[PDB]
Design an enzyme around this catalytic site. Structure first.
Site, PDB file in Angstrom:
ATOM      1  N   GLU A  93       0.806  -1.217   0.000  1.00 53.15           N
ATOM      2  CA  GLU A  93       0.000   0.000   0.000  1.00 53.15           C
ATOM      3  C   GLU A  93       0.841   1.269   0.000  1.00 53.15           C
ATOM      4  O   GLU A  93       0.809   2.026   0.981  1.00 53.15           O
ATOM      5  CB  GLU A  93      -0.943  -0.002   1.210  1.00 53.15           C
ATOM      6  CG  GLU A  93      -1.903  -1.176   1.177  1.00 53.15           C
ATOM      7  CD  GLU A  93      -2.834  -1.255   2.381  1.00 53.15           C
ATOM      8  OE1 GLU A  93      -2.420  -0.942   3.511  1.00 53.15           O
ATOM      9  OE2 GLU A  93      -3.999  -1.646   2.184  1.00 53.15           O
ATOM     10  N   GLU A 144      -5.368  -8.453   0.784  1.00 49.44           N
ATOM     11  CA  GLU A 144      -6.054  -8.052   2.009  1.00 49.44           C
ATOM     12  C   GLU A 144      -7.524  -7.812   1.702  1.00 49.44           C
ATOM     13  O   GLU A 144      -7.871  -7.215   0.676  1.00 49.44           O
ATOM     14  CB  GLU A 144      -5.499  -6.764   2.657  1.00 49.44           C
ATOM     15  CG  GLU A 144      -4.112  -6.851   3.249  1.00 49.44           C
ATOM     16  CD  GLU A 144      -3.712  -5.602   4.034  1.00 49.44           C
ATOM     17  OE1 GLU A 144      -4.592  -4.782   4.379  1.00 49.44           O
ATOM     18  OE2 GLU A 144      -2.510  -5.439   4.315  1.00 49.44           O
TER      19      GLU A 144
END
Length: 447
Positions: free
Chosen positions: A168, A354
Site C-alpha cells: 500500500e 487483504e
C-alpha cells in the site's frame, strides 16, 4: 447467505495476513531499532487513545500461538511482513543476525505445517535512522531498500517463493506525507509526490534485488489498496472529480508499474517535478509475477474546491451496511476491481492480498466471540471473488485481513480485524465465529 466456492480452481491459494509492526511487539528486543511508527506513537494525539505498538500481540515472543491459529484455519498460505529495523536496524550496513533468524525460523515452521510463506518486505516500518536522512524524500532510501531486499532474499529465498515489495504505497506517500495521519506525519504535497516516486523506484529496485539474490527464482509483486472512485452526482464537475480521485488512489500506482508512465492528468494536477533520472521508468515497470489487490471499500467522490491541489472530497457511500470504522460494505467493488485489473491492466495473476472488516466484538469470559457481521462480510466478498473468476479473471488466491486482532495504525487497537480475538493483557488468541467459518469454507472447497 452461504457462499458457493466450487468454481474456484483447486490450486486457489487460501490465506490470511498480518504485518510486523501491527503484531510483533518486542520493539526494543534482540537488536531491533525504532521505526518511524515507533516514533509516530510517541507524538501526542497521533494514535487514537494513545495506543502504541510496543507490545501489540507479542508475536515476536508468541509466534507459536500464531502458528496454532494458522493450523486451525487450515490456510494454504500466510502473508506476513519482515521488520526492516529488525533486520538492518539503522537501514544501512550491519545485518542484525538475531532478527533475521526469527524470520528464518518462522519460514521453517510454516513449511513444516504445509503453509506457504508470502513475505512482504516493506510494510511501513521504515527505520527511523533512514527517516533522519530524509526518509522517502531521499532517493538513497530506495537503494537502502534494495540492499535490504537482497539480504532477505539471499537468506529466505531458497524456501520463500512468493514476495511482495511494498504494501500500500498510497498509504505511505499520501497519508504519511500529504495528510500526515500516518508515519512520518508530514503534511506537504511536494514531499508526498516525491516520496511516492521514490517508493515506486524502491519497488522496482527491490524486484531486481530479489531476482538477483534469491537462491530460487521468486514470484514478486506490488500490493496496492484500490478503491473504485464513483461520482456523487452526474454533474460534469463530479464526474471529473471522481476521475482525479481515480488517478490519485489507483492509476498513479498502476500506470507506471505497468509500463505506461505516470498518468499525465495527475502529473498536471500535482504540479510537482518528479525526481526522475534516466532509466528510472524501466526500473519502476520491472516485470512482476502478480499484482496484490487490497480492497475494503469504494469511494464516492464530489468536486470540492476547498481541498488544495486535488479539488475533490470523499462523501459517505450509500449502502446501509457500514463497519465500526464507518467503511461502507460493498462487495461488488471487489469483483469490479479484480475485473479491472484483469481487463484494463492485463494482469496475468491477481491475489486479493487483504480484505476484511472491523466490528464491535463482545467476548465472553473465555474470549469466545460470535461475529456474524464479520462472517457475512467475508462470505459476500468471497462470492464477489467467485463472480470475478466466472468472468475470466485470473484470481489465484485470497488473504483475509487479519489472522488476529492487532494494532490498526492511527486508530490504535479499537478496530479488531481478526478472525481470532486477542486478549491483549495475556496475548490469548481465540478463534472467532468468522475464523471457524473460514476454516469450514476452505475445507469444503478442498473436498
Amino acid at each position: 447467505f452461504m457462499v458457493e466456492l466450487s468454481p474456484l480452481r483447486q490450486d486457489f491459494v487460501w490465506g490470511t495476513a498480518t504485518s510486523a509492526y501491527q503484531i510483533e511487539g518486542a520493539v526494543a528486543d534482540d537488536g531491533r531499532l525504532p521505526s518511524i511508527w515507533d516514533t509516530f506513537c510517541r507524538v501526542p494525539g497521533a494514535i487514537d487513545n494513545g495506543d502504541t505498538g510496543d507490545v501489540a500481540c507479542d508475536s515476536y515472543h508468541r509466534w507459536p500461538e500464531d502458528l496454532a491459529l494458522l493450523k486451525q484455519l487450515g490456510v494454504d498460505a500466510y502473508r506476513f511482513s519482515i521488520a526492516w529495523p529488525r533486520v538492518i536496524p539503522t537501514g544501512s550496513g550491519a545485518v542484525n543476525t538475531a532478527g533475521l533468524d526469527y524470520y528464518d525460523r518462522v519460514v521453517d515452521d510454516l513449511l513444516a505445517e504445509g503453509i506457504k510463506p508470502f513475505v512482504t518486505l516493506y510494510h511501513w516500518d521504515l527505520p527511523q535512522a533512514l527517516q533522519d536522512l530524509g526518509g522517502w524524500d531521499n532517493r538513497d532510501t530506495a537503494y537502502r531498500f534494495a540492499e535490504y531486499a537482497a539480504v532477505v532474499g539471499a537468506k529466505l529465498g531458497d524456501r520463500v517463493r512468493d514476495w511482495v515489495t511494498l504494501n500500500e504505497p498510497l498509504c505511505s506517500a499520501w497519508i504519511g506525507h500529504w495528510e500526515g495521519r500516518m508515519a512520518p506525519g508530514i503534511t506537504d504535497p511536494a514531499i508526498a509526490v516525491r516520496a511516492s516516486y521514490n517508493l515506486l523506484l524502491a519497488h522496482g529496485l527491490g524486484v531486481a534485488a530479489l531476482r538477483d539474490a534469491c537462491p530460487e527464482p521468486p514470484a514478486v509483486g506490488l500490493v496496492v489498496n484500490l478503491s473504485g472512485c464513483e461520482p456523487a452526482s452526474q454533474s460534469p464537475e463530479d464526474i471529473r472529480a471522481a476521475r482525479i480521485a481515480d488517478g490519485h488512489f489507483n492509476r498513479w500506482w498502476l500506470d507506471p508499474t505497468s509500463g505506461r508512465g505516470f498518468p499525465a492528468d495527475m502529473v498536471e494536477t500535482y504540479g510537482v517535478e518528479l525526481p526522475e533520472r534516466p532509466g528510472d521508468l524501466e526500473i519502476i515497470a520491472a516485470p512482476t509475477d502478480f499484482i496484490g489487490l487490497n480492497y475494503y471499500f469504494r469511494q464516492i467522490i464530489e468536486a470540492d474546491g476547498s481541498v488544495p491541489v486535488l479539488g475533490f472530497s470523499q462523501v459517505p457511500g450509500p449502502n446501509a451496511e457500514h463497519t465500526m470504522i464507518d467503511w461502507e460494505v460493498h462487495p461488488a467493488g471487489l469483483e469490479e476491481l479484480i475485473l479491472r485489473l484483469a481487463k484494463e491492466y492485463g494482469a496475468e495473476k491477481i491475489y486479493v492480498t487483504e480484505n476484511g472488516s472491523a466490528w464491535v466484538d463482545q467476548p465472553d469470559a473465555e474470549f469466545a466471540v460470535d461475529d456474524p457481521d464479520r462472517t457475512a462480510y467475508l462470505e459476500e466478498h468471497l462470492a464477489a471473488c467467485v463472480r470475478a473468476v466466472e468472468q475470466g479473471a485470473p484470481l489465484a488466491g485470497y488473504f483475509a485481513w487479519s489472522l488476529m486482532d492487532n494494532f490498526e495504525w492511527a486508530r490504535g487497537y479499537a478496530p479488531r480485524f481478526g478472525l481470532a480475538y486477542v486478549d491483549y493483557p495475556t496475548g490469548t488468541r481465540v478463534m472467532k465465529t468468522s475464523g471457524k467459518r473460514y476454516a469450514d469454507l476452505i475445507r469444503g472447497h478442498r473436498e
